[PDB]
């Protein structure tokens, strides 16, 4: 579990969104596993605006923050699960690391801020849904 809180926005994994989120929907993309909903109180997270490929992510299944190297956002085939059939997920970045289903929502950060959130796992890899291209998160 986990979310990013930037301004009046709440960014979560789409497969984990709640009732409150869909009723107050700003934007969602099934192919990216992302959903953004509006909030009453202001958030304090800063979104990174960079091309960093090294950062640190939180892994709830180990209670540890791990430093990682990660690939650039791309279209990656993701196996069928209880949330989606087998499909290509866009804007996904992979790293070598530990990730179990309950790890989705863990933040990946670099020196410039939040890069993304855990979205995929298994086979000794962890995938992060990139948020650095969503420039509108910084305004309105």
Ligand X SMILES: NC(=O)[C@H]1CCCN(C(=O)Cc2ccccc2CS(N)(=O)=O)C1
Question: Is the alpha carbon torsion for 85, 88, 93, 96 positive or negative?
Answer: positive
Question: Using CA atoms, how far apart are residues 134 and 48, in angstroms rounded to an integer?
Answer: 10
Q: Quick one: tokens of 122?
A: 């298994």
Residue selected from 2, 7, 43, 101 as contacting ligand X according to rule CB under 6 A: 101
Question: Using CA atoms, how far apart are residues 35 and 72, in angstroms rounded to an integer?
Answer: 21
78 binds ligand X (CB under 6 A): yes
- Site track 17-56 with ligand X (rule: CB under 6 A), x = hit: ----------------x-----------------------
**Residue 106 Cβ vs ligand X, minimum distance, rounded to whole Å:** 12
**Residue 89 Cβ vs ligand X, minimum distance, rounded to whole Å:** 6
Active site residue 98: no
56 binds Zn ion (CB under 5 A): no
For residue 116, which of 125, 108, 106 has the smallest C-alpha distance?
108
């Amino acid at each position: 579990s986990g979310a990013i809180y930037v301004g009046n926005y709440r960014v979560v994994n789409r497969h984990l969104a709640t009732h409150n989120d869909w009723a107050n929907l700003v934007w969602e993309d099934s192919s990216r596993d992302l959903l953004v909903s509006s909030t009453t109180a202001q958030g304090c997270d800063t979104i990174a605006r960079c091309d960093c490929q090294t950062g640190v992510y939180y892994c709830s299944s180990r209670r540890k923050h791990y430093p990682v190297s990660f690939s650039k956002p791309s279209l990656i085939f993701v196996e069928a699960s209880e949330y989606y059939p087998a499909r290509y997920q866009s804007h996904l970045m992979l790293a070598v690391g530990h990730s179990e289903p309950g790890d989705c929502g863990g933040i990946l950060r670099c020196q410039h801020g939040v890069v993304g959130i855990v979205s995929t796992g298994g086979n000794g890899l962890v995938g992060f849904a990139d948020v650095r291209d969503l420039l509108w998160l910084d305004e309105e």
